[PDB]
């Protein structure tokens, strides 16, 4: 109920504790026309399933810095050559260096890249934002525009869905089967009733 992502009805709560999932919460049954059938998730006799912790889904600063040096060297070598060959760069070349480097390479392709060239001292004013806005900003130290988000959660959510039993392993806990939709595709959540 907790670690299920938000659109599947859960709260999408991140975790950094050794949270064990009992094997009584990875079992789901569906009634085909011929007859009821039952399923588990650890279909081979293995260890107890464990919620993935955020600890394993954030690259260490050391690796990020050395990779930033290497990736910016690659970009410099891939741009000075482009001067001689007379063509602009493209997503095709830099996809291998995507989402890497402390000023993330994806920032170069950002729409407002020109105006952010005239944004100087942005980190200092981000730090002093605490005195102007009431609620503290957890990401005071950076700014998503100027160096991109420095973390990825797609793998984390992938592994959470995999460990929780998937769409049917989570929906068995829900009231989804009571609603009787033929399949879970083609649905949206009305986060706000009109009334």
């Amino acid at each position: 109920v907790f670690y299920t992502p938000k659109e599947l009805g859960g709260l999408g709560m991140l975790s950094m504790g050794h949270v064990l999932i009992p094997q009584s919460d990875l079992r789901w049954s569906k009634q085909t026309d011929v007859g009821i059938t039952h399923f588990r998730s650890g279909m081979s006799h293995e260890e107890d399933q464990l919620i993935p912790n955020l600890y394993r889904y954030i690259q260490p600063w050391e690796s990020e810095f050395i990779d930033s040096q290497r990736v910016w060297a690659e970009y410099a070598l891939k741009r000075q050559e482009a001067i001689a060959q007379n063509r602009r760069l493209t997503l095709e070349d830099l996809e291998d260096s995507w989402d890497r480097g402390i000023p993330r390479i994806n920032t170069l392709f950002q729409k407002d890249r020109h105006t952010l060239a005239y944004d100087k001292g942005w980190r200092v004013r981000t730090d002093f934002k605490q005195y102007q806005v009431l609620k503290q900003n957890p990401f005071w130290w950076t700014h998503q525009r100027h160096d991109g988000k420095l973390w990825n959660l797609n793998n984390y959510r992938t592994d959470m869905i995999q460990a929780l039993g998937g769409v049917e392993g989570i929906l068995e806990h829900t009231l989804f089967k009571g609603t009787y939709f033929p399949t879970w595709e083609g649905l949206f959540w009305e986060k706000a009733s009109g009334f």
Binding site: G17, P22, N53, Y55, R56, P60
Partner: peptide, 22 residues
Amino acid sequence: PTGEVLSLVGKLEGTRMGDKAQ
């Protein structure tokens, strides 16, 4: 079995931060 969160202190013997996140 219980839903209480167990501290992963002493649970880091065979894991790294960058592992399972490429």
